[PDB]
Amino acid sequence: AQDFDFFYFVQQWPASYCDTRRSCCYPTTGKPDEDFSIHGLWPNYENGKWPQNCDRESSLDESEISDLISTMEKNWPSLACPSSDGVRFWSHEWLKHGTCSALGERAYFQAALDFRKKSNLLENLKNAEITPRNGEHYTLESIKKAIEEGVGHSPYIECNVDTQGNHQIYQVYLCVDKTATDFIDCPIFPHGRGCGSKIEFPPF
Ligand SMILES: Nc1nc2c(ncn2[C@@H]2O[C@H](COP(=O)(O)O)[C@@H](O)[C@H]2O)c(=O)[nH]1
């Protein structure tokens, strides 16, 4: 029956996408909030492979999520250049991953928004006294533990490197069950050997 096993729910730390050697452009709506934003909700298999581009005939219909656009501009902004309203980013995510989710367009985007709010990363880190600042000031362990206490499941953290060589928290992966109802323990995690023991949680 069900075409896949679980979802990776991926969030990015905007400031870490914008302090690297690559180009970053603020959205048509201006500088994003200093908070974790959605990268994607990705159907996946327990074997590490995943389905993608399941219905190449299905394009993103904005009327279906009209009332959600202003919220998505702030919670799912595109930071790529050139600057955009996010729609291209959302259309691409819908076509590549959403069409493989078994969810209708609105349910897919509502699920991503709902899980970003539920995971409440910035606040869970704040409770643990982990707040944005420059330099590799935080242990990776404290970051994972803070998120885990708040979500009830352990995240996978992907790090990248800023312009000054600092290793920084870049993306956070959590797993959601195939019916997109709750967070679950991840059956598998990516293997992108990354994140030293001390990392940066950069401000904008
Ligand atoms: N479902 C799923 N998609 C992935 C995974 N790793 C890579 N991809 C997809 O491939 C893209 C990688 O782009 P690249 O960094 O290779 O230019 C991701 O944004 C995502 O759409 C994974 O573990 N699961």
Ligand SMILES: Nc1nc2c(ncn2[C@@H]2O[C@H](COP(=O)(O)O)[C@@H](O)[C@H]2O)c(=O)[nH]1
């Ligand atoms: N990580 C990331 N990718 C973005 C952003 N804005 C647009 N993109 C684009 O979205 C692609 C990832 O989409 P996916 O492969 O998961 O469907 C990237 O290759 C990149 O070109 C952003 O803010 N962050």
